[PDB]
Amino acid sequence: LNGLSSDSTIDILYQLGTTQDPGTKDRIQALLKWVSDSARVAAMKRSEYGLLMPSPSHLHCVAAILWHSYELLVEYDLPALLDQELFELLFNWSMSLPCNMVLKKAVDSLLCSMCHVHPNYFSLLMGWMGILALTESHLATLASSSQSPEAIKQLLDSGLPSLLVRSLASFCFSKMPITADLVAPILRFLTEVGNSHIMKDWLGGSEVNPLWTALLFLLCLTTQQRTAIENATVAFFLQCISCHPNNQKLMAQVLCELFQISGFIRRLFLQLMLEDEKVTMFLQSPCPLYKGRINATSHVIQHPMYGAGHKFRTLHLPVSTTLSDVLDRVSVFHLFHKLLAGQPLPAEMTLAQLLTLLYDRKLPQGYRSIDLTVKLLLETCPIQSPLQVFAGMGGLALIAERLPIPAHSLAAFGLFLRLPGYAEVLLKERKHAQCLLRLVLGVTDDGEGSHILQSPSANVLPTLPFHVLRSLFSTTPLTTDDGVLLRRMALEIGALHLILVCLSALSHHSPRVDVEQALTKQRLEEEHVTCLLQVLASYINPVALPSVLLELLSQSCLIPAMSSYLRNDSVLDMARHVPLYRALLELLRAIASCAAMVPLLLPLTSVGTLLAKMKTCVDTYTNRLRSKRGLTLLVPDIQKTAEIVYAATTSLRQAN
Asked: Which organs or tissues contain this protein?
């Protein structure tokens, strides 16, 4: 069967086309003759098997040959071979093919390479399209063929993207007629051309940014039309904000204005913000990259600049992917970037750190792909995710106001998200934060088919909301005004109430005013009580306070709880719950450092006396150990902390 393609034949054709020897010009002419003969046979059939059924992979390989030989500065007249007659033949061929067909994509890659060699061919193409009644085929061909800096500049200067954006905005808020059927094709066209960073900058510019709000207003029509427009809008926004900080700021601003959480806006938020950003990596090697290739025929029609054959690979990877993972996907191998000239990239960098470095080295923001070379900085901050941009503008607090894992943990997380700075502390663990955020939006999957509960470190999720709060309170002192506002808002929104209500249900005490299945439950509850005690300690004594605090902490189950934990005469029994007792001591040191709270330690059988008894227990235990001659860190904790609490109560009673 003639004309059948495979990775091997594609590589053969690419080597023949791009091998620069005195016959290369004739080989290129032969490839273009095959292309022209295939196009003409297609035209006849519209009105020899290698012509009747040209491999899309082979047409794309010819396109990649043309692209790379144009960029390789060949010693023959490459532009002379690419005549306007061939361009017109290919334009008619592609215009005849239905959209989304792989053959049409290959012919359009050929058109893209020809426009890249002769930019005036893009003007001819636009004229032939009428650049109005642009069909989906017109848009597909134009988007594919405009993927060159010259063609993209001409497309922008034609006013066609502006016309499309204005017409789409006029449609959303209700010069070129737009119907609901044309909205999704136009959005797909804008996404395709927005593969380019120039169009990506234009789409996040002042002329287009009304369209973002217009789309959200329209989505926040037939049911199928609404679904198509919603998917197209999500794809469009993802392309616009993909590794593009300025468009991320714009998207965050638009979302915040929208909020100032169900249906499309939830779906959008889940797809745009609660999923890892994906970036395109373009790997070039001086030697073939075979790992990951299947011997069966595959028509991978990408942009011709990404080459063809074994020495070029294109991977759409999450930005969390390490460079070692990329190399293992394609294959001592060293990854290099042109901007970081002559510096092997460390294998554990991650693509986010690489993007940070490259944007620092003047890589255009939103650039379509990371272009690495496989030949043969780890402190770098990862590039901000769109969620970090949204959170940094208070967007998550806005979402919080519109919002197995314990239910109280989720409710606490939803409430704590309204606190100032909470989202910024939360997002220091991007994947953990993503899991919680997806959970509070009513989504159990992580976006990749994996249940969050069955995800890595799903055992830290239940108390993660409270650990974030402890870090928030602990790094925010009382002296600073943000700390007062934080402490005041926490009480006002009910964060302190929830913590004390959770303390009641988890310590099993009440406000003062199978066998292993139960054991693991008891251990889980004590880990929650531990963090809740620590959260309270950091709220009172970070490493001023609302006046209704002492009343609230006195009517609360807190005094019951700490007294019962302090009513333990078995130092070895304290060795089994060290995290709880260290947290208990820290919460007592917090109360002992706040003269307004010390009243909580003196008699209402006081906690201060109970702590005093616990001290005598441990000093006697030490004496017995001395006589015989995690208690290690806990044996001084009660000792030192008893002195703090004892001293604090003595000073108060002297004051009285």
From this structure: Expressed in brain cancer cells.
* Separation of alpha carbons 255 and 341, rounded Å: 39
CA distances for 208 relative to 129, 218, 407, angstroms: 23, 16, 42
Q: At which residue do the structure tokens 């909301």 appear?
A: 465
Cα angle, residue 398 at apex, residues 395 and 401 outer, rounded to 5°: 155
In 3D, which of 366, 408, 355 has the Cα closest to residue 244? 366
Method: cryo-EM
**Contact call for residues 365 and 245 (beta carbons, < 8 A):** yes
Helix axes 495-507, 481-493, angle to 10 degrees: 60
- Distance, CA of 130 to CA of 297 (rounded, Å): 37
Query: How far apart are alpha carbons 398 and 391 in whole angstroms?
Result: 9
* Domain assignment of residue 178, yes or no: yes
Of 192, 191, 6, the closest CA to residue 109 belongs to 192
Distance between CA 333 and CA 433 in Å, rounded? Answer: 34
Specify if 383 maps to a domain: no
| Token duo for residue 358 | 């490259």
Contacts of 219 by beta carbon, 8 Å cutoff, 6+ apart:
226, 229, 230, 233, 264, 265, 268
* Among candidate residues 375, 404, 435, the one where a domain is terminated: 375
SS3 for 1-25 is CCCCCCHHHHHHHHHHHHCCCCCHH
For residues 509 and 640, state if they share a domain. Answer: yes
Structural resolution in Å: 2.3
Check whether residue 119 and residue 212 sit in a common domain.
no
Task: Name the residue among 645, 646, 506 with its Cα closest to residue 580.
Answer: 506
CA 456, distance to chain mean position in Å, is: 17
Picking from 449, 475, 501, the residue at the C-terminal end of a domain is 475
564 shares its domain with 443: no
Residue with tokens 């997002």: 427
- Count of structural domains within the chain: 5
Mark whether 518 and 632 lie in a shared domain.
Answer: yes
Which domain covers residue 409, as residue numbers?
Answer: 394-475
